[PDB]
Amino acid sequence: PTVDDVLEQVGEFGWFQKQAFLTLCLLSAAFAPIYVGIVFLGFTPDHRCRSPGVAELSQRCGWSLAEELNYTVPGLGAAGEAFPRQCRRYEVDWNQSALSCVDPLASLAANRSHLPLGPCQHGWVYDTPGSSIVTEFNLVCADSWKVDLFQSCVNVGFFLGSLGVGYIADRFGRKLCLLATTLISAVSGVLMAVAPDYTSMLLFRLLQGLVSKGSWMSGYTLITEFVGSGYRRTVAILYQMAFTVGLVLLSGVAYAIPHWRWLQLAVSLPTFLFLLYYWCVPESPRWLLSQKRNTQAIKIMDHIAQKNGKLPPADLKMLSLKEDSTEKLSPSFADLFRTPQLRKHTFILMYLWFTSSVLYQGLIMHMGATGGNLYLDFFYSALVEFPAAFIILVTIDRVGRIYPLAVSNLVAGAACLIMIFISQDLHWLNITVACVGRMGITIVFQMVCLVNAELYPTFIRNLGVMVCSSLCDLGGIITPFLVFRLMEVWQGLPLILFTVVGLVAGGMTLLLPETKGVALPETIEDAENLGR
């Protein structure tokens, strides 16, 4: 009367599993707005110094937007690529000075650079009709650094929340967390849209970042536990693919409404509405069984059978773990680093996450020039993931999990190396090769997440994935400084670093025990001899 066998008898993937997965997938998209980052909310458009006098002249004679930029603004390319033009204002009187459209400012100085440069007051004038966080508080020229501070604060919030949310998640149940985390994320999201100052915006975004990844991972583990042992691949990969669909939909709606306030206020509400379906999914049976709450576990199991409609097995009356466990099974950080096998697994998974994140950021950084339409570029970058799902979805159970993960982790680094060595000049090849690397990295991410979820004990499964995921955000934070510094020493030093990181990670993956078609562990001692 073990949990897995009774689950087989009552249907591994029945109509109950489909409904629960539909709801959790509806939750999946809610993580796209918080994960997409500052983009679509802090895009910096073209900007020049507003002048009062230009407004008068603009109507007097025929004008064009391109023409106004050229001979009304200070020229670019002096003492910097575009530092003068962006936020420097000549401050020559354009009002009550009728010098004709042909020669508005030429006559006075007989030269441009020598002209007198004043302060860039009167705020700024922006190109795009929409408004972003940059346009709101004028964080353009003097305070430009503030945007980087905002991004770094969000990332450090991710990093802290990764560690923090795990313990509150596993000790107090997987549905007490998913409910509270998504509720806090929703309330922070709407509260943000009414932020009048810059401090409140940062604080609310920090809270949302703290809670979002916890919500997403507690949603992931729940379905992974619910589904049968054999059908884990479909549930996990379709969860990731739902996340990708949510990303595409976010790009679409972002192009729909440019304004940041309305964008946030609209995209956040569906996460709040998801709360309306909290009553659909109950607590995971395995967690309850491991906590010694057997009556609730059997009650939940009977409900699954009733909705699925096959039959209730009479053996449930004696449902319990394989071996008579101890009264208390509290999750703690100390228990994570006791068994040598579990310690080795944790170290290997941490390194895997770190290398995956570093290689991803290196690839995106080393990409080609950005396209004219940011939205179209983001749409393509999201769409490049769909074939990854249909590649992985058919290979896991047929070939196992270690080999594809290792081979993709190797091929991503190989593609980075070939891009470094082979000509990087504008050609049709390079874009497609980069797409190959993108698909490799996406496969690595999804496979690492799945294997890490499957490898840990059930009673601390969430904590393990949280800890091993923190290094992902750590690497994402640190990589830009590393690549900037290394470039100074040698032109190609960062590329060698990325390639060696990828190769070493791919080599080290092989030692991780395989999990093809084996019931996920429920006891740390049992997980220790998983390979045996």
Ligand X SMILES: *[C@@H]1O[C@H](CO)[C@@H](O[C@@H]2O[C@H](CO)[C@@H](O)[C@H](O)[C@H]2NC(C)=O)[C@H](O)[C@H]1NC(C)=O
End-to-end CA distance of the chain: 24
Which of 531, 501, 499 has the alpha carbon at shortest distance from 518? 531
Closer to ligand X by Cβ: residue 49 or 202: 49
Query: CA 480, CA 353: separation in Å to the nearest integer?
Result: 17
DSSP state of 318: G
Contact present, 223 and 204 (Cβ < 8 Å): no
Closer to ligand X by Cβ: residue 71 or 386: 71
Closer to ligand X by Cβ: residue 106 or 383: 106
Find the shortest distance in angstroms from Cβ 390 to ligand X. 51
Query: CA 450, CA 428: separation in Å to the nearest integer?
Result: 34
List residues bridging with 118 in a β-sheet: 89
Alpha helices in 257-309 (DSSP H): 260-274, 285-290, 294-308
Find the shortest distance in angstroms from Cβ 79 to ligand X. 18
Binding site for ligand X (CB under 6 A): 70-71, 106
Query: CA 28, CA 177: separation in Å to the nearest integer?
Result: 15
Closer to ligand X by Cβ: residue 55 or 106: 106
**What long-range pairs does 490-496 form, CB within 8 A, spacing at least 24?**
492/420, 494/362, 495/366, 495/416, 495/417, 495/420, 496/420
Closer to ligand X by Cβ: residue 70 or 370: 70
Contact present, 428 and 420 (Cβ < 8 Å): no
Closer to ligand X by Cβ: residue 105 or 168: 105
Residue 523's SS3 state is coil
> Within the chain, how many helices (H) and strands (E) appear?
23, 2
Closer to ligand X by Cβ: residue 59 or 70: 70
Ranked by CB distance to ligand X, the top (closest) residue is 106
Sign of CA dihedral 20, 22, 23, 24: positive
